[PDB]
Amino acid sequence: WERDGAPSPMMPNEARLRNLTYSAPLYVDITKTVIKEGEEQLQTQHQKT
Amino acid sequence: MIYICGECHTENEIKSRDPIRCRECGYRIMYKKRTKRLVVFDAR
Amino acid sequence: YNGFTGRKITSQIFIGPTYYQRLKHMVDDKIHSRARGPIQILNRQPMEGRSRDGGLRFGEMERDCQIAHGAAQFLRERLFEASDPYQVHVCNLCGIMA
Amino acid sequence: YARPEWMIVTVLPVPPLSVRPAVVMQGSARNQDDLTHKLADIVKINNQ
Amino acid sequence: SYTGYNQEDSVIMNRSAVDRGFFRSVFYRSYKEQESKKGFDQEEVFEKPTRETCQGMRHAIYDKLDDDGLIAPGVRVSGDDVIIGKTVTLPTKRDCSTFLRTSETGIVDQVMVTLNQEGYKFCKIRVRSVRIPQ
Amino acid sequence: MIIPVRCFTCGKIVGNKWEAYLGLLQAEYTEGDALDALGLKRYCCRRMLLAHVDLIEKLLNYAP
Amino acid sequence: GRPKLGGLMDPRQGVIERTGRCQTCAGNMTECPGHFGHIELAKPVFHV
Amino acid sequence: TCPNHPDAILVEDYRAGDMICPECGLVVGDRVIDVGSEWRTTMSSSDRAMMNAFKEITTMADRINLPRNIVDRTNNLFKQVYEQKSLKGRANDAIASACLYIACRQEGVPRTFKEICAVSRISKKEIGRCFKLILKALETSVDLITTGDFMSRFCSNLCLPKQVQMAATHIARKAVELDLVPGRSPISVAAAAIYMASQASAEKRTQKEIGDIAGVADVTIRQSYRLIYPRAPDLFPTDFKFDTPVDKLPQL
Amino acid sequence: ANMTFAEIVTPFNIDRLQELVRRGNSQYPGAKYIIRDNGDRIDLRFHP
Amino acid sequence: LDLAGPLLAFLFRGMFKNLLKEVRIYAQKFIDRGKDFNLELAIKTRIIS
Ligand SMILES: [Zn+2]
Ligand SMILES: [Zn+2]
Ligand SMILES: [Zn+2]
Ligand SMILES: [Zn+2]
Ligand SMILES: [Zn+2]
Q1: How many CB atoms lie within 10 A of CB J41?
Q2: What are phi and psi of E89, to 5 degrees?
Q3: Cβ of E60 under 8 Å from any chain B Cβ?
């Protein structure tokens, strides 16, 4: 991610040249369920957190 | 003060104040242009 | 044939193509020297400046060797005159540095 | 040369500046030595 | 056993072969430097230091440096030369230039300027030195 | 990187025999026949072409 | 901008900067051997 | 203090780390330079609260992949503000979030308040309050944001091609120069210029997609677009390739 | 050329040493410094 | 022989435990305060990165 925040695929040569760390963004799907003792459950899924 | 964009090899003049970003390609790797000074090599 | 005089060498020499490798150990990377170079201000002892002039450690083995040699004058020079020559004024009555 | 009462610190000796010097680093910043740092606390607690 | 100079694992080499490129090699040393504004009181920047700008400067000439504070490729360098002119603001400004060692003598092969992982202006200077068998 | 201009051992010019040598190999000559055809009598000169590795052809694959 | 007397960096303890001399020794950074300061303890302390 | 030549600039020499009389050669000082030191060639509550602020800044900054130079700059802004204490009553999370916005502005890579709000628990409102207070507390100011500062991020986040991003940049700048969007927020103009440029290209994006990434309501985009739409042929670059002609762009 | 030995000036080497002094560091063999009777050190490369 | 896989899997297991530990602490503080918590804010991407 450049200073301006634009993501760009990092080539290994750029990583060696610019002293970057050649890393892959890791995402996980998370499902949040909440119960408020009111015989009801709310289930929400945070995709690719 | 000319720098050569490492990607598109396009020479661009950059001052002390402006960023390194390539004028056309936006690439951020710039190589200084070869010196105009005369360097002599004895062919030994 | 001997290159200097051209006379044949009495023994025949074994000669042929052999693969050789040049190792990364160049002499220019290992040559270093030190003569009254920079010193650490706290320790007042040799240290590298803008070269490899850090000096050689005159360790226990060199001291013990010079002791066996009996070169007490050289032993003193290496371990004192050549590293951190210093002098102080001391009180004869209280033995403390004055 | 040695006395039992001298084993009690009634006055503290402060080492010379050369034993605990303040080096100049990254400009004019006087980087004080570890002893000077503790000497600052000693005098603060002493005054307190 | 030609004249004894090869004794005890030593080797004698053909000077004319070495002169023809036998085992000749090139040694490349890459010097990296960055300008970082960590701490608002300190601001290091690449620029050729000048007498009126620095309260104290050594007699080593900075004439090899360009207006951007970096030496250009194709310039010969030695331990007496400065490859990078960096200066930091004092709370006059101090000079924190990057010198080569007295043993380091070569030619600047390449000088690239970029923004490193930290986003700070960064550069690498590769110095080329030809190692002839000796 | 590239074919030596002179044979290290004896100085015979070999820097002009590389494309000739490769041309002969394409013409199905064996390495021994090709070196003979080029006039590389000494094993020191033969060692130059027979053992050369033309990496410059590989370095030219990267854009300037 | 200058060292203070009776402070941790009291100029009598030694040379303050390489381009100076302590008033007690009148000698340079290397010539001056350094001198000890002292802190009178408001209460005696056991020497560890 | 030259013994020989007073009022002489003694020359510092690295060969031995000493100073020499510049007009005699007499060596003054034994080896006082320490050339290697010159050129290489349990916690206070105030510090603890600052440490927590730093951990908060690095956390918020990492969520948006802000570079470390911006974090250092932010930490220096926070130290000055925290030491100035005119915001001593404000929560450190608000000060840090406001400091992060200022650092991005000072660095020329502005993040909208909604973006900084999205990574911090503090609302835009409280961030806005601490922001203005900090500028006064620091007695400084930040350059006014421009439509071109967001094009790179929004277009990249929208996966828009380079020419679309350039067209959007030209469209937004020209719309501001032509004053077609008076008083509109630059984000709204940027989003509208991106919408126009996107719709003119093969890579078509909806107002919701652009709205979600730019942080602008589709209504605000629609209004801002409606103001610039009549001048669309003048706003696009002369050297642009239209997949959908400017005269046929969506009218609403 | 880098390492040195301090030769005491005697009427027997005064002339030989005078030669090495004028040669200095630029020409090998030469001399790096002169130590006067006062104990002061003079670098010949600064004022040859 | 513990190669790059078994070695990195051992770290990621420890770094993930810390991530979940950190999410519990953050979410629990907000739940105790009686307010919902934003899952996207609880996660400290610095732990794994
Ligand atoms: Zn480019
Ligand atoms: Zn006494
Ligand atoms: Zn041959
Ligand atoms: Zn003194
Ligand atoms: Zn003088």
Answers
A1: 18
A2: -70, 135
A3: no
Cα angle at H99 between A5 and H184, to 5 degrees?
A: 65
**CB of H175 closer than 8 Å to CB of H181:** yes
Ligand number nearest CA of B20 is 1
CA angle H41, D32, D25 (to 5 degrees): 25
DSSP-assigned letter for residue B33:
P
Asked if residue H226 lies in contact with residue H219, where contact means CB atoms within 8 angstroms, the answer is no
Task: Using the 3D structure, point to which of H122, H141, H160 is the last residue of a domain.
Answer: H141
Decide the pairing of beta strands E25-35 and B30-32: unpaired
Interatomic CA distance for residues J40 and E116, integer angstroms: 28
What distance in Å separates the CA atoms of residue H27 and residue H20, rounded to the nearest whole number? 4
Beta-strand runs (E) in chain B: 2-5, 11-13, 30-32
Residues of D in contact with E94 (CB under 8 A): 26-27
Indicate if the alpha-carbon torsion angle I17, I23, I26, I28 is positive or negative.
negative
Q: State the sign of the Cα–Cα–Cα–Cα dihedral C18, C23, C27, C28.
A: positive
Q: How far apart are CA G34 and CA C98, in angstroms?
A: 10
Experimental structure resolution, Å = 4.0
Q: Which residues of G touch D40 (CB under 8 A)?
A: 8
**F1-64 maps to CATH 1.10.10.60:** yes
H243 and H157 in a common domain: yes
Q: Ligand 2 centre and the CA of C90: distance in Å? A: 7
Domain extent for H113: 44-141
A-B C-beta contacts closer than 8 Å? 6
Q: A21 in contact with E at a CB cutoff of 8 Å?
A: yes
By 3-state DSSP, what share of chain J in percent is helix, strand and coil, each rounded to 5? 65, 0, 35
| Final residue belonging to a domain, choices H141, H162, H191 | H141
Tell if the CB–CB gap between H16 and C48 is shorter than 8 Å: no
What is the residue-wise DSSP string for E69-92? SBBPTT-EE-TTSEEE-EEEE---
Residue boundaries of the structural domains of chain B: 1-44
Q: How far is D21 from chain C (nearest CA, A)?
A: 7
C-alpha E112/C-alpha E33 separation (Å) is 11
Phi, psi dihedral angles at D43 (to 5 degrees): -70, -35
Q: Do the Cβ atoms of E114 and A18 come within 8 Å?
A: yes
Task: Say which residues have a Cβ less than 8 Å from residue C94's Cβ, sequence separation at least 6.
Answer: none
Q: Do D11 and G40 touch (CB under 8 A)?
A: yes
One-letter amino acid at E109 equals D
Cβ separation I41–H22 shorter than 8 A: no
Count of all residues that appear for chain B in the document: 44
- The technique is cryo-EM
Ligand 3 center from residue H28 Cα (angstroms):
62
Extract the tokens encoding J15: 């770094």
Per DSSP, what are the bridge partners of residue E65? E71
Q: Is D21 on the interface with C (CB under 8 A)?
A: yes
Q: Are H137 and H87 in contact (CB under 8 A)?
A: yes
Chains C, F: CB contacts under 8 A, how many?
A: 3
CB contact under 8 A, A26 and J40: no
Q: Do residues C72 and C64 make contact, with C-beta atoms less than 8 angstroms apart?
A: no
**Tokens at B10, concatenated:** 């396009």
Buried/exposed code over I3-31 (b: 16+ C-beta within 10 A; e: otherwise): eeeeeebeeeeeeebeebbeebeeeeebb
The residues of E annotated as belonging to the active site are: 9
Contacts of E55 (CB under 8 A, 6+ apart): E90, E92, E94
Please tell me which of the candidates H14, H31, H37 has its beta carbon nearest to residue C50.
H14
Q: Which CATH number fits domain B1-44: 1.10.287.990, 3.40.30.10, 2.20.28.30, 3.90.1150.10?
A: 2.20.28.30
